Amino acid sequence: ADFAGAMKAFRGVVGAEWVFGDEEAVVPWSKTYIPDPAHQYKPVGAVCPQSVEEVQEIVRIANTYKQPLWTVSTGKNMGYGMTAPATPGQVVLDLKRMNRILEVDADLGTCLLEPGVTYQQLKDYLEEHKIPLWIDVPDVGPIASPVGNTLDRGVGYTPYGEHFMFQCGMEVCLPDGRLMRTGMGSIKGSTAWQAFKWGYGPYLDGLFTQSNFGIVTKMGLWLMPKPPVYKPFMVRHANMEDVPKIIEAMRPLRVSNLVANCNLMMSASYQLAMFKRRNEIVPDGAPLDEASLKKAASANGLGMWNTYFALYGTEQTVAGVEPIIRATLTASGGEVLTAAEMEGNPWFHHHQTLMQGGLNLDEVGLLRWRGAGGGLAWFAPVAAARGVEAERQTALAKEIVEKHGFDYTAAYAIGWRDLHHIIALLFDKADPTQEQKADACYRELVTRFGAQGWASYRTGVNSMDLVAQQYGEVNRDFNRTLKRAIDPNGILSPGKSGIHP
Amino acid sequence: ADFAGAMKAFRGVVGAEWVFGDEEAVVPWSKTYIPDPAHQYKPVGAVCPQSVEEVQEIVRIANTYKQPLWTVSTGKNMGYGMTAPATPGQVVLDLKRMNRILEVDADLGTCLLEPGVTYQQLKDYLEEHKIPLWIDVPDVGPIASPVGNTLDRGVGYTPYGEHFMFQCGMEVCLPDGRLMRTGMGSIKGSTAWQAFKWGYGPYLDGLFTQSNFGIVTKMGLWLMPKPPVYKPFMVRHANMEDVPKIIEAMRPLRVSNLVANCNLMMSASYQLAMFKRRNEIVPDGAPLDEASLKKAASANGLGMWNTYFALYGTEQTVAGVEPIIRATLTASGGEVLTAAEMEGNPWFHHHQTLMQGGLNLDEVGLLRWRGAGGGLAWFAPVAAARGVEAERQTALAKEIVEKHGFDYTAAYAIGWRDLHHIIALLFDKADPTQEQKADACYRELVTRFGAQGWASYRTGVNSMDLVAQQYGEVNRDFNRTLKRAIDPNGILSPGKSGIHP
Ligand SMILES: Cc1cc2nc3c(=O)[nH]c(=O)nc-3n(C[C@H](O)[C@H](O)[C@H](O)COP(=O)(O)OP(=O)(O)OC[C@H]3O[C@@H](n4cnc5c(N)ncnc54)[C@H](O)[C@@H]3O)c2cc1C
Ligand SMILES: Cc1cc2nc3c(=O)[nH]c(=O)nc-3n(C[C@H](O)[C@H](O)[C@H](O)COP(=O)(O)OP(=O)(O)OC[C@H]3O[C@@H](n4cnc5c(N)ncnc54)[C@H](O)[C@@H]3O)c2cc1C
Ligand SMILES: COc1cc(C=O)ccc1O
Ligand SMILES: COc1cc(C=O)ccc1O
């Protein structure tokens, strides 16, 4: 890499005030929450363009100077690396200034977005124009990107919660600086770019998700019509061991699509961690015992597991399914509760907001759990939607985290036929011993889960190689063949998803 | 290519009795219904393996001898080329004997299939085991493949009608002879291969749809639970010119998901062609005039457009949406009819079967429309689900087919935000002048649609290059870059989707 030559050329493209080219200037891009005992996940520069033409020029320069770029949209991948690159020596290509809402089609229920568009911005746009469409939001703070989130295949909590399913068309700047539109978008003045996903020939959009094959400059997204009626529910289960029965109850409701939104099944420990520090619940040095958890949860109107779902449509369609749902969940030991029973309950309010695609009030309490706080890494294994799988994964995760002196703080995001088991590894990052222990714990989670046949849907920059190692060697080789063909100079996000030039 | 050396080595793998290696022996793989005036779409051999290990050996030999393989599952791509390869000198790799149903998961609603499994076979398997799951079938005759259809991104008529959306996990033999499993499948003894679509890192399954980058040897598919209640409907519209009003009435019902199955909006001419020859309707030499069509359709209980939809659930969920659906469609000039009104109507019966994923036992009447018959080519442009687009595409297609002496015989398959406009170009293939005219007509359809911003979702081997030409030059280059990297010897289906080594 010729770093100095690249950065000088980048100033010529975007202006000197949008290039950040030394240790002090790149501080805003360098903070992470994942464990990093060797201090190895850090950018060496950042560049912030406002147009796709600037992106193209930047890519051309990256090739000439052999200077890799780590592309982000808004860069709020918290617990997964924020804007830290996977390998040393990279410049962050921060697309936050490319924040234009290009189209919103009220009739077809679609939009077309630049990467820097935020969820807040899109929701404001819809409301200001009185367009009766909803968004589908992850459980994040004030800033996050539909484009960035979708490209990492993230998740929200309406019927449109599996974000990548609802993507339709994209524009990519390929590593040589040429633009390519997927689906119907390469037909000049196509009116169907946001209407038909697949196009003609090989379906390419998935190559640009969790990958380093292209820079997405525009993305189409389907949006759900606002329903006449929205009815949120909470199911409370009393015992830690209820895990398998909850999944077995929900599975039929989801496979038959009586419930259609992604359902967060939240542990009491996670819920408490959102609003309380660990030392409000148990002494430092003591385990997070189930009696203390149960007492604390009960005092706050929570069970040991609390699962959130909603119904959408009319009073009549809601009444068609609500009885069967109530029967199935009550038979599993759950108490089904509505807004009228959960008045003033901040967890119910939190999920009632999420499940209509509302924006919650900034405040990530999770970062202050243990000691000085500041340590969070997601460990996010997949399971089939089978109670026995959830039972076993809960047991193994708890065993491993507790062996390293950490707590089990987790949720299951229940999907159609799958679960995303979301495990927050919360630690005191400011204590270097605790950061080292969290690193060791994380490695043990990945390795031992992999040995039982389980691996992650998504992971942070510090674990992308170790997670890749859980999946097949042929897969690893095939990804590398694609990388080398698409990006011969290896200038896009080396190490993303364990893919190296 | 060294054809003789390749075919000798193939006999060693599968047995001499499963290699077909001269003009006479390959006759069963040679008949097509598309126009082919130069007789250029034809295989030079066929090989029929029964195991994945045989496939892998075949692929190794194909590399050694530089002998291209044109891979099919059951090969019933009627109107798209059957088993004829896109370029000369290819051997059909016919996977019909790999017909094992590997798994069916009743609780998660999934299955895992080899390519040769037919729809009939899978339906029989479900029925015989009393498994309360349905299939989703295209409107084909007795033999077709869930795998082959899904890989060409085909369509059926239940809520699971957009077939590729419901695929989950695949195994592929790569061009070098190695097997790769997508999604969660490359984790040994993963139990989530049919549970979670995306896996980790780039999403690859779409690369193996409408493509020549691999041979699919196993594919997973989600299956819909059988609903307590199934209620089919037919909407009759009186006038040829109703097209835009029908799309505008159905679009909100589909965008809001009050109707969830893919809806065939059938022209009267197509419907009549299913069961009648053209000279039962008008004289040879006369146009298929709207008054003759209306009279013939009316005598059969058909409108000029007849649109089929269904509701699935309980008596109460159906009652939740049926009034709104009826009001929307009646306001558009439609008459909404149910089984009780359509007793003895063979078209209603045909669609009522399709919309519950039933197998129609029938010959393909369409192949006998004009003269000696035998000519069929699908022209299948996409539209957004907007009335004005359907109006304009119907007008243009009518203009073009009638200019060349052919009829407009078409349907729209209404999707969520899209339409597949399915235009059957029916001709007398046994008359060489008519075959030439149909060839010219088809070229004009593709070219002139492309100039208005419209192009095909799928096409036949004789037009794959011309359809590729309607999409972007960068797309074409990118697909060629992938092809050369993935299949360096160019031995898998050269010319599929216009992708050439
Ligand atoms: C308390 C908490 C709760 C959370 N809840 C959720 C949740 O419910 N669901 C969820 O999905 N996540 C969740 N997250 C994780 C994360 O914060 C969000 O997913 C967030 O939306 C990701 O950041 P972002 O939108 O800024 O995307 P980015 O950080 O901009 O993008 C993510 C990644 O995509 C790639 N990328 C982004 N833009 C492009 C581009 N234009 N071209 C190519 N590649 C690009 C890069 O690899 C990048 O690192 C949570 C995090 C926390 C701390
Ligand atoms: C009257 C009529 C009505 C029809 N209605 C419909 C309809 O409603 N919906 C619809 O979708 N189609 C329809 N068709 C078109 C077609 O007949 C079906 O799509 C049929 O299912 C395709 O044949 P097949 O299943 O044998 O697949 P195949 O012909 O085996 O496969 C199709 C293509 O996929 C690729 N392929 C197949 N198997 C493999 C593999 N294992 N590895 C890699 N590539 C492979 C090849 O390119 C192959 O040519 C209709 C046809 C007619 C004549
Ligand atoms: C469903 O995916 C996620 C959910 C969350 C929090 O709810 C955090 C990280 C994730 O990847
Ligand atoms: C929805 O796709 C198709 C439908 C048909 C017949 O109804 C034929 C070919 C197709 O591609």
Residue numbers in the entry:
A (entry chain A), B (entry chain B): 43 to 543
What's written in the study?
Enzymes of the vanillyl alcohol oxidase/p-cresol methyl hydroxylase (VAO/PCMH) superfamily are found across all kingdoms where they perform a range of metabolic functions. One of these, the 4-phenol oxidases/dehydrogenases, catalyzes the oxidation of para-substituted phenolic compounds.
The enzyme from Novosphingobium sp. was of particular interest because it was predicted to lack a covalent flavin and to feature an unusual Val/Thr pair around the flavin N5 site, beside sharing 43% and 36% sequence identity with VAD and VAO, respectively. The same properties were exhibited also by the T181D variant mutant, targeting the threonine residue that is typically an aspartate in the known sequence-related oxidases. Its crystal structure confirms that FAD is non-covalently bound, supporting the notion that removal of the covalent flavin linkage does not drastically affect the properties of VAO/PCMH enzymes. The protein exhibits a narrow tunnel leading of the flavin re side where Val181, homologous to Pro151 of VAD, is in direct contact with the N5 atom.
